[PDB]
Amino acid sequence: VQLVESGGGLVQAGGSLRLSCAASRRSSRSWAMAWFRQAPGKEREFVAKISGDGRLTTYGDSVKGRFTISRDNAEYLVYLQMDSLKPEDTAVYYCAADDNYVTASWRSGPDYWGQGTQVTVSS
Numbered sequence: 001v002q003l004v005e006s007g008g009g010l011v012q013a014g015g016s017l018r019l020s021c022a023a024s025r026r027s028s029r030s031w032a033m034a035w036f037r038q039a040p041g042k043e044r045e046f047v048a049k050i051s052g053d054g055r056l057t058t059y060g061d062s063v064k065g066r067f068t069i070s071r072d073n074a075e076y077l078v079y080l081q082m083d084s085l086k087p088e089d090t091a092v093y094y095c096a097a098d099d100n101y102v103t104a105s106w107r108s109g110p111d112y113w114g115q116g117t118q119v120t121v122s123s
């Protein structure tokens with residue numbers, strides 16, 4: 001099972017970017033999904049998570065009100081809409097899956113991890 005992140009690249013502060021998460025296989029179980037990000041020298045940090053059915057979301061305090069997480073269970077995609085970007089925000093973004101929604105925001109929670117997509121925000 002491979003998680004594959006898309007949509008990373010070079011963008012401008014105050015811009016928008018959409019990332020997406022895809023999977024190499026479908027599962028018969030309902031998974032909670034998350035995005036995490038990791039800047040040059042730091043820990044992988046929580047960004048957003050979403051319950052199996054798309055009903056529950058929670059956001060890391062630094063992106064709250066700016067990023068929207070949502071999912072399309074038909075196409076099997078997870079999306080991260082990133083509005084009002086800042087130079088901080090520059091990071092490798094990773095999509096992940098977790099068998100429950102409680103642990104999904106905890107670094108050791110997720111059972112599956114993407115290889116990551118580079119987002120760079122200039123001023």
Ligand SMILES: CN(Cc1cnc2nc(N)nc(N)c2n1)c1ccc(C(=O)N[C@@H](CCC(=O)O)C(=O)O)cc1
Binds near residue numbers: 029
């Ligand atoms: C976490 N997940 C990927 C996954 C799940 N839900 C999604 N949901 C959405 N909306 N978007 C995705 N990209 C998405 N990706 C998985 C997890 C396990 C396996 C897997 O090893 N296959 C087994 C394990 C799970 C099972 O027993 O059903 C299988 O038979 O399906 C597949 C994908």
